[PDB]
């Protein structure tokens, strides 16, 4: 099945349902307090002001989502972008994150980004495997950088290189809008 | 013989003599516009509400400075802290930076952080060797992540481990006045 489409604020509810147990009971995310539905709604809208936000859907329900965000604040970094992907429990390994990425990555390239970074709390062999298969390269690991759920956690970064690190790059454009 | 003291907003114009050419003509900082003196005042003053900010003085004039800043926004990262040290061109480069860190690092340890991170625009043999002798470890490099002054630049990160990654860490305390 599976169709990828642009996310909407109305997807907040299913997205929150996917994301809340990840915040609650895993070190996948370094957030501590479960974000409300209303919060995820605002995160969707704000992200869309500049970046793609995507959902994967199967028979009308959201089974995963993906979005991009700013890699770092300072001007010279503006060709670097962060990517985030999540899949509902029980729908993993069925290729959903892969499909999300196969849409998100080309979108980012055409916007003007030169590289995308995925932050992965380690260990997570299934997430590493997926990024290795997609062609990301592991460029570094911040060891025991986070504390959550009674343990210290490594965070590795995986880089997808869009190429075209040419000599006169132009600033990336808005997904659908702003400058 | 160079002395280290905590910085004050009234040091802004002297700090700027150091920062301005770094911004205008090096990749040492990925900022592109020189902050106004008013901005520098607010930066120093804002950092101090929670973090140490230091200057190195030789014959009464600021020849270098250093400050800590938040590593990442998410709650689980609150024991990680970023460090930044800049030194004027000319004499005693390494000595100045070393003395700065010899004060900054122990201050951050006492405050309750578990690790500090320095980002280095690469190559920079002088800075790398300095971090290495201070006991930092190179944990990753973000290749071609920034574009500035007609080239793409890698940024490597060096980690200072304060130890004490125990099971019940208490949140870090504010440098002079609570966080
Ligand atoms: C291990 As993780 O929860 O993917 C940390 C990334 C977070 N967006 C931050 O920058 O603070
Ligand atoms: C190359 As560099 O100015 O050492 C990168 C750090 C920058 N402060 C940021 O995090 O935005
Ligand atoms: Na990190
Ligand atoms: Na970076």
Author numbering:
A (entry chain A), B (entry chain B): 4 to 182
List sentences quoted exactly from the publication behind this structure.
The arsN1 gene encodes an N-acetyltransferase that confers resistance to arsinothricin with high selectivity over the related antibiotic phosphinothricin. Here we show that ArsN1 acetylates both AST and PPT but with higher affinity for AST, indicating that ArsN1 is an AST-selective N-acetyltransferase. The overall conformation is a three-layer α/β sandwich fold, a typical GCN5-related N-acetyltransferase fold. PpArsN1 forms an asymmetric homodimer in solution, as shown by the extensive interactions of the subunits and size-exclusion chromatography, similar to related N-acetyltransferases.
The AST-bound PpArsN structure shows that the L-enantiomer is the substrate of the N-acetyltransferase, which supports our assumption that L-AST is the active form of the antibiotic. PpArsN1 has two L-AST-binding sites, which are asymmetrically formed by amino acid residues from both Chains A and B. Both binding sites are composed of seven residues: four residues from Chain A (Ile31a, Phe33a, Ala124a and Val158a) (green) and three residues from Chain B (Arg75b, Ala76b and Arg77b) (teal). A similar water molecule bridge was also observed between AST and Asp85 in AST-bound PpArsN1. We propose that the small difference in the As–O and P–O bond lengths allows L-AST to bind more tightly to PpArsN1 than L-PPT. In L-AST-bound PpArsN1, the bond lengths of As–CG, As–CE, As–OEA, As–OEB are 2.0, 1.9, 1.9 and 2.0 Å, respectively. The volume of the L-AST tetrahedron is 3.00 Å3, compared with 1.86 Å3 for L-PPT. We predict that this substantial difference in substrate volume affects hydrogen bonding, hydrophobic and van der Waal contacts between the tetrahedral substrates and enzyme that accounts in part for the 100-fold higher affinity of ArsN1 for L-AST compared with L-PPT.
